[model samples]
Target: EKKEQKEKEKKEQEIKKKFKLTGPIQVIHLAKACCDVKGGKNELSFKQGEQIEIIRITDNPEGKWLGRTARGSYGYIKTTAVEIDYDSLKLKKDLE
Candidate 1:
């Protein structure tokens, strides 16, 4: 079971690497749960109708959702929660 989970994580990482090189995809969600406490990683909460600053993007059984930082650490939220404004989320960081 643990091995399977590792493999799943590895596959997700590979996908993330690919997308990171490609370009900005729409960010679409917020964590709708209390997460990161009690060592709960990747759980999410939701934003009612505001733009939540994105923290990261990751995959679960459902697929990829944008991660957001709260307080200090990060949590996962569904992609649907974030309505994508492509122009707003455009990348500013250039190669350094």
Candidate 2:
């Protein structure tokens, strides 16, 4: 159980480390829950058709992505678990 707790804490720290400091806070890119994502610890659990905002987009081969739901809950989830229709969620095309 002790090892389990340590393992759990580790993942959280990794997320924070990747987020780092002095980064873009960004805007809400909408997504549709094409499929239910019932996940493990450090994940956002949701049913079908729930709307959420993508927090951090990554190239993780483990199928990991960070999300923020309307309830303000944030966690790691599968990238394709939700329909990332960024076709409409365009950025301002400028940066500071």
Candidate 3:
């Protein structure tokens, strides 16, 4: 089981390494669940206030996006759960 989990994680890391995130974003809405794939390994779950790095936006049928968290958990997140307030210097200051 551990070996399988490691392989899953390695695959995820390889996929993630191919692209760079747009920038850091804040979770505005609550996320009760993580991203899941049918017959595939799922990503980690996150809370409402947790910050995540969005790799890129996608037009996925399920509306899940690829992202990475502080804990190195990389997975898809719902677009509605996040916000990009780039114009708000106050928010940027706080995040940094």
Candidate 4:
């Protein structure tokens, strides 16, 4: 019985190396997803005006990225659907 649990852990470790949770980001469009992890819980749903916090982004833009909501629902979000917060993007320019 424990052997099966160990097997799952092995696969989790393999996936863990795929992405590291660096920090938060901003999303401009509606973010939706159906899976947080390959062998873990499912879907996170949110609308356009709601906040979608980026938890983990990958080296490849096409790769699956991790994001969460205020309610704490986590799921993979597409890179094409989001961009960094525009406020932060050029805010430093006006700082004096």
Candidate 5:
């Protein structure tokens, strides 16, 4: 059992690393809409107009990205459901 759990943790870490983001992000939609992680849990939903720190974008047709919310909830969000935060992008541009 311990070995199995350890493997699961390792796999989760690998997935997280694959989609890690350099900074945080925010939802830019006008109203509240729920979104779910593509392959993970649909039970974990994100609200529209919610700000989240993006982990990484998945290379898929649905355009999904992994992210974590202020509440520390991690899940996948639709690419269309949110946009890059202005401040975050501005900071990146300024640094560049």
Candidate 6:
């Protein structure tokens, strides 16, 4: 039993190291007609160039990226459109 748990934790750490999360979210109108979001939870009030960097993605089934906020609460955003910081992900061996 302990061995299995250790293996699971190892796999989780591997996944974390493999995926690089560093990007901004692109906010759009919930809808053209009403401001109410159809499928989303709430519309974030942002300025012209509000950006966010991924800190840690949640363990949810959907695997949404958890973004850091100016306030306290972390916002959950989709990971599909994340613009990964390639410079951070570049392998050291490649440069060498």
Which candidate has the highest lDDT of all?
Answer: 2
For all the candidates, what are their Cα RMSDs to the real structure? 11.2, 9.3, 8.6, 10.0, 8.9, 13.8
The residue ranges of model 4 lying beyond 4 angstroms of the native Cα positions read: 1-43, 60-62, 87-94
Tens-digit lDDT track of model 5 for 1-96: 445332313333433444554444454322223443333433225665566666455443345666556555545555555554545435456455
Query: What's the lDDT for all of these models?
Result: 0.41, 0.60, 0.48, 0.45, 0.47, 0.36
Q: Highest TM-score: which candidate?
A: 2
- Candidate 3 wrongly placed segments (more than 4 Å): 1-43, 58-62, 87-96
Q: How do the candidates rank by TM-score, highest first?
A: 2, 5, 3, 4, 6, 1
Worst 10 residues of 5 by lDDT: 28-37
**What lDDT tens digits, residue by residue, belong to model 4 across residues 1-96?**
445332322233323344444443444333433223232333235555455666655463437555556655454555444443434445568576
Model 4 global lDDT (CA atoms, 0 to 1): 0.45
Candidate ranking under lDDT, highest first, comes to 2, 3, 5, 4, 1, 6
lDDT of 1 by residue, 1-96 (tens): 445332312334433453342443433433333322332234444445434555345434445444544442233345554544444433555653
- Give lDDT tens digits, candidate 3, residues 1-96: 445343324445543543334343454323333333321344435665565666455444345666656655666655555553344335457565
Residue 35, candidate 4: how far off, in angstroms?
17
Taking all chains together, each candidate's TM-score versus the true structure is 0.34, 0.58, 0.42, 0.41, 0.43, 0.35
- Displacement of the residue 24 alpha carbon in candidate 1, Å: 15
Look at candidate 5 and tell me the lDDT of residue 41: 37
Clash pairs, model 5 backbone: 19-55, 19-56
Per-residue alpha-carbon lDDT of model 6 for 1-96, expressed as tens digits? 445332312233322333333342332212111122122542222322344455554443346654433432234445443333443433456665
Worst 10 residues of 4 by lDDT: 6-15
Pick by lDDT: 1 or 4, better one: 4
